[PDB]
Amino acid sequence: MMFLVVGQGNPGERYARTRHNLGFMVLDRLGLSFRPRGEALVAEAEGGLFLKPLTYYNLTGRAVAPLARFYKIPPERILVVHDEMDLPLGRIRFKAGGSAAGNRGVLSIEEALGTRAFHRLRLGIGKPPDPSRGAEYVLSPFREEELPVVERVLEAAKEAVWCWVREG
């Protein structure tokens, strides 16, 4: 296996529209065929793997590390796609190593792998007006007025993902 693309999210229909499931939403735009493999939905394409862990958001390392270890996927070929409160909706940024900047899904993968040196695709979702409501904000759906931006973010993310996988 050449690489591993991980979409951050939570399992179950009740989380499917929430901001914290934006990484699953990107993965779901890729055209792939996901199959259940333990606490994970996994797809194989282009010589590599795509993973929607069903571990819960903060526990995704539990699915990522056994897969990476087993197929000897190096951290340079692991990409973690996730929602990011520190960037405004509409903004997308790649990140190579460095701190799991308080993203607990990225943190759980660092913990389980024993390294910070994997890549992340950060998808800005903005912040809530009050910091203490962060969990609430990410476990809410987007506002209907955000949907046009969200769509275009998903389109841009889908291209970024394939670019990272493929040509660049």
Author numbering: 0 to 167
Give excerpts from the publication.
Peptidyl-tRNA hydrolase (Pth) hydrolyzes the ester bond between the peptide and the tRNA of peptidyl-tRNA molecules, which are the products of aborted translation, to prevent cell death by recycling tRNA. Pth releases the tRNA from the peptidyl-tRNA, by cleaving the ester bond between the C-terminal end of the peptide and the 2′- or 3′-hydroxyl group of the adenosine at the 3′-end of the tRNA (A76), and makes the free tRNA available for further rounds of protein synthesis. Pth1 adopts an α/β globular structure and functions as a monomeric enzyme, while Pth2 has a structure similar to thioredoxin and acts as a homodimeric enzyme. Here, we present the crystal structure of Thermus thermophilus Pth (TtPth) in complex with adenosine 5′-monophosphate (AMP), a mimic of A76.
